[PDB]
Amino acid sequence: IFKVGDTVVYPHHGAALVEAIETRTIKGEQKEYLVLKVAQGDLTVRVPAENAEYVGVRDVVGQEGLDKVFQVLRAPHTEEPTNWSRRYKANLEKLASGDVNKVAEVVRDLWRRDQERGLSAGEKRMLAKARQILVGELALAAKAETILDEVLAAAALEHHHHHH
Amino acid sequence: IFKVGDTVVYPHHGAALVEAIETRTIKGEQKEYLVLKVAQGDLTVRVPAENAEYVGVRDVVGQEGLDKVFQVLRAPHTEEPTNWSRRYKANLEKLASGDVNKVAEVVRDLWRRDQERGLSAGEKRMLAKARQILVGELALAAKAETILDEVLAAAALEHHHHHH
């Protein structure tokens, strides 16, 4: 599917914030445009609101929280306990921690182990549990929870290195 | 669907280049990892090659070409002839120009007019034609041509402003 020198379209998911909704009169009707703060924000994106299919994320998480979740999932050099019990215990606490960043460490570590060493039965179940927790915290109050779960999962497998 | 202060996941599509494929021994088998140059590149993304679903784009276009196509589609302040004939003539030449950036001006201008004033019959047909040309130039030699057409179309409607 790939080889050195190939070009591909890479979807750079990150948080965006709706900073303004500008209203215009179009075809007799009132149609909204979003003004999005993107990339912290070095980027402003303006886009028709009916042509916008961006998955929402809860206010309590917010733009910094969301970007923080991505940063955790994509961290390249992690440390996890070598022994199963140690590893399992520390994850179990994280899932109970009430800190969604902690939950994202669990989702990330276990997704990556699944791809490389494979998972034990308990570890498989914990990954599923952690995934539901991650999503339930971010998703707005089902096809969103599914897209969000795929995006976060894709992010878990990507190691991001910044070098400006 | 939206309101000021909302947080959403924004997919920042852009070109990425495969700069290395590193090989590891996993579960007895040989499994590849991609090293992607992203954002020109201030970003390196490393990701398992079996877990990579990035649409390919032809070498003759390349990473700069692809990023150039995006920049054209997302240009915020365009000028297009006010009169139909003037507008139609200049677009017709662009589609014949053999410059894919020219084709992307046509795809962008006409998508945006469709959302705001609506299209004449000839303009509708030209937009369809321009879309097939844009895709055929980028896509590798059908579900890719469809994803690529959606991504480029989504990009046509977004105005991007940079402010670092």
Curated annotation (Swiss-Prot), chains A, B:
Query: Cross-referenced Pfam families, in alphabetical order?
Result: CarD_C, CarD_TRCF_RID
Q: Which domain of life is it from?
A: Bacteria
Which terms under GO biological process does the entry name?
rRNA transcription
Keyword field: Virulence
InterPro entries named in the record: CarD-like/TRCF_RID, CarD-like/TRCF_RID_sf, CarD-like_C, CarD-like_regulator, CarD_C
As for what it does, the entry says: Controls rRNA transcription by binding to the RNA polymerase (RNAP). Required for replication and persistence during infection of mice.
Q: Which PANTHER family match?
A: RNA POLYMERASE-BINDING TRANSCRIPTION FACTOR CARD, TRANSCRIPTION FACTOR YDEB-RELATED
Q: Which family does it belong to?
A: Belongs to the CarD family.
Q: What is the name of the protein in this document?
A: RNA polymerase-binding transcription factor CarD
What gene codes for this chain? carD
